[model samples]
Target: MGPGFDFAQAIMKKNTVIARTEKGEFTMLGVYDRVAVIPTHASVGEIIYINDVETRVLDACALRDLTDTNLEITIVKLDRNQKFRDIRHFLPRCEDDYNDAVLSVHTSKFPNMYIPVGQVTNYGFLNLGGTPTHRILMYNFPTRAGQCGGVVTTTGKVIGIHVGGNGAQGFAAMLLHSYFTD
Candidate 1:
């Protein structure tokens, strides 16, 4: 399932989810795209809702990636008792390869547009404010507001989270089997 597998060669677009958290007296909640898993560092603490209605957060936790400091993944569990229906399941792949054709989902406007199949480019360190954090890069990623923690995927697999990006490209945090077990 490494190559020659294409779930349309793009991650099927999903709903826009808002992740809200309060670090202090100030609370911040912003919109992001979700396809399979919610891997944004921005997502922590709070209630989940769809279509402006209350959706419950059953559980969530931080899963650390061994190599990347920026892979601050928070796996979210939604309540099964609440009768909340989500259009797509939050699925996570084991990992992704460099130079694979991948797409990221983001909604700045209508259709919740897919970022199209872009070059996986390369995997490298992300220098955030000179801190030099690590993450994966994809060329041809289009910029959008609230794209932090968005979904990145290839055909047949929901691979990573849209961490950050530029005008020509973007980045996502690859998944690991650590801190998550049956």
Candidate 2:
């Protein structure tokens, strides 16, 4: 197996952190092998919990929640200072995709299951406040079991959020290197 496949072994329950919040807010997930946290929505909540391996527990404050529709995705960090981290309870994790294969991290129920990424086609362009954009369509995925608000990784690096399916295939509101500017 390639390094990507081998490294994937390192991402199970050990380092993986579960993100839970009100069904409406976004918490983010990770895959390829390991899981990662992605922040959605605007910075509003107070007692939000960013992913810390040795601390928080089940029903724990994994990630509280905001934003830019599909532009902003957050990673929890206490330092909050990649450049100036505390600007809004954030860390620099979300980045751009390299047009590579990804995996969907799903541990929502009991044992953690991993679904390999499939054909990601273009769904034409969308008008986001005048900016014409093409959104990625995550297809070929057989199950959308427990990936909502989940995060996907490009070689173990966070790339976007798993926002469920639209009838058949799934869609991840991907936000690459454009970490800030929410």
Candidate 3:
């Protein structure tokens, strides 16, 4: 047992969805309100589906450092037609006071069940889309494809969004205060 088993259990209930882009299923994390985040690389405005419900990409920003990896995330609208109920909203938690006991919740390799992968090993900045964004690092997290845009949390707060990384070393784009307002 690493940490965030409770968080993982909570996430599994709601706060996540399967985003389909041309039949490719990817992970999307719901945060504060009905808005959810997905990887920008998944392509935007191309007739996407949220849990099989037709939806559109609201916003796409290269918030993650392109020099390192494809960590770009986009905002999307979750189905409000009772398809996804009991949404657990994640309030953005800044990394100004970060913690080592961190975990990422995503439904990539595993469907319907969001796994909490944890224990941050490092924290730093990456030039993402020209902006110096916060980044988190972890080891042996079983990082896999289609897990991009996963929510990274500590205890009960959302600290960051999972960026693509190898299974050995994982990365996340730390959420900023401005993200909530804007």
Assess every candidate by TM-score: 0.61, 0.51, 0.68
lDDT of each: 0.47, 0.42, 0.58
lDDT per residue for candidate 3 within 24-67, as digits (tens), equals: 67767666566666666566564678767887554545444546
Clashes of 1: 4
Candidate 3 segments exceeding 4 Å error: 1-3, 58-71, 82-93, 96-109, 112-117, 126-142
State the RMSD for candidate 3: 4.8
Q: Which regions of candidate 1 are displaced past 4 Å?
A: 1-36, 66-68, 80-96, 104-110, 129-132, 177-180
Judge candidate 2 against the unseen true structure and give its global Cα lDDT, from 0 to 1.
0.42
Higher-ranked by TM-score: 1 or 2: 1
lDDT by residue for model 2 over 1-182, one digit each (tens)?
A: 45544433444433344554443333333322222344343242434443422322122122311322343334443322212212112222432334454554644363444556645554423343343333343645654546655544445454446655645666665644333324
Q: How far off is residue 145 in model 2, in Å?
A: 4.5
Q: What is residue 170's positional error in candidate 2, in angstroms?
A: 0.6
Candidate 1, residue 150: the lDDT equals 56
lDDT per residue as tens, model 1, 1-182: 33423452233422334443432111111112221245544555656543334656666666544654655456666542432223233344244464455443443232343455556754666764344555465557565555655555555445566666666666766654333344
